[PDB]
């Protein structure tokens, strides 16, 4: 029940960030929220990385951790991910 | 710099309508949710209106939602508001407002007044 | 609605003396995801359009000096400025930038004794 409360924020979070702000210079990835994690404005051609999302119910042991995914050289976001360091640590 | 430009205001009789206009330069408009905010004479500020910057979400304050309208046209950087049935409570300095995260209220325009009166 | 109360109404104080004025939410402002308390505050000059003062209870905005200072959490929030300049004199907003509808406290207006 909080879980879902929290990951729902997590959502509200991403919308207004994108909201409030603007992409970078030249091309870039489009900001978007994918169910899992919010994805900033990224320049083309990188591999982005975002905080492992705050609403994880581990998200305590994991808060230095990272989840990454690829911003194409065409300003395309690739459907590839590793979210390795932000597995829950049993 | 960002700066928001406020045009429109003047007298409404009540009941009356009246579209405010915002231009906006100094930043990337498509990519910014835009507000309304408004301020009696003498006193504070009221939250009136906000819309996404694809249009795709917009909220309302009770004391105004069924009457104004928010609208934008990004390519000409401009932020409207469409108000109708205008009554003596709507008489106020209208602000146009952008967004830095984290906050969703940042900048400010110079305002414009709008009196409704008869 | 979340109900922003402020507190004083309005005071008086000399150059180089410090003030501190409060803002209080009818509801918490604290989101125990990100562990951000949603308040903002705004300075608004005479004659002036409102201008942006501190972000998230005590994030300060770039341009905005040292001697301005939010802090506080859940509902009790609290703004001080420090070594207080002719210029400072303004009406003092706090905001809820939680949820909306976005609701403004009713403002505390700083006045210079001369």
């Known amino acids: 029940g909080e879980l879902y409360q929290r990951w729902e924020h997590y959502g509200q979070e991403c919308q207004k960030m994108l909201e409030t702000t603007e992409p970078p210079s030249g091309l870039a990835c489009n900001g978007s929220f994918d169910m899992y994690a919010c994805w900033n404005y990224t320049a083309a051609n990188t591999t982005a990385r975002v905080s492992c999302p705050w609403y994880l119910p581990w998200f305590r042991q994991v808060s230095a951790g990272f989840v990454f995914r690829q911003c194409g050289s065409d300003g395309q976001w690739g459907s590839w991910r590793d979210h390795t360091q932000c597995e829950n640590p049993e | 710099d960002v700066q928001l430009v406020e045009s429109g205001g003047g007298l409404v009789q009540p009941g009356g309508s009246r579209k405010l206009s915002c231009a906006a330069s100094?930043?990337?408009?498509?990519?910014?949710?835009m507000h309304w905010v408004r301020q009696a004479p003498e006193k504070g500020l009221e939250w009136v209106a906000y819309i996404s910057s694809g249009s795709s979400t917009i909220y309302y304050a009770d004391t105004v939602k069924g009457r104004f309208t928010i609208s934008r046209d990004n390519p000409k950087n401009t932020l409207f508001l469409q108000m109708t049935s205008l009554r003596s409570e709507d008489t106020a300095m209208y602000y146009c407002?952008?967004?830095?995260?984290?906050?969703?209220?940042?900048?400010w325009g110079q305002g414009t007044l709008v009196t409704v009166s008869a | 609605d979340i109900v922003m109360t402020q507190s004083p109404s309005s005071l008086t104080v000399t150059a180089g003396e410090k003030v501190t004025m409060s803002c209080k939410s009818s509801q918490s402002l604290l989101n125990s995801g990100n562990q951000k308390n949603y308040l903002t505050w705004y300075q608004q000059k005479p004659g002036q359009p409102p201008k942006l003062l501190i972000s998230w209870a005590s994030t300060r905005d770039s341009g905005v000096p040292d001697r301005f200072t939010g802090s506080g959490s859940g509902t009790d929030f609290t703004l001080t400025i420090s070594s207080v300049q002719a210029e400072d004199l303004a009406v003092y907003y706090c905001?809820?930038?939680?949820?909306?509808?976005?609701?403004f406290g009713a403002g505390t207006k700083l006045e210079l004794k001369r």
């Open positions: 407002a952008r967004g830095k995260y984290p906050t969703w209220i940042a900048y």
């Open positions: 905001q809820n930038d939680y949820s909306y509808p976005l609701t």
């Open positions: 100094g930043f990337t408009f498509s990519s910014f949710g």
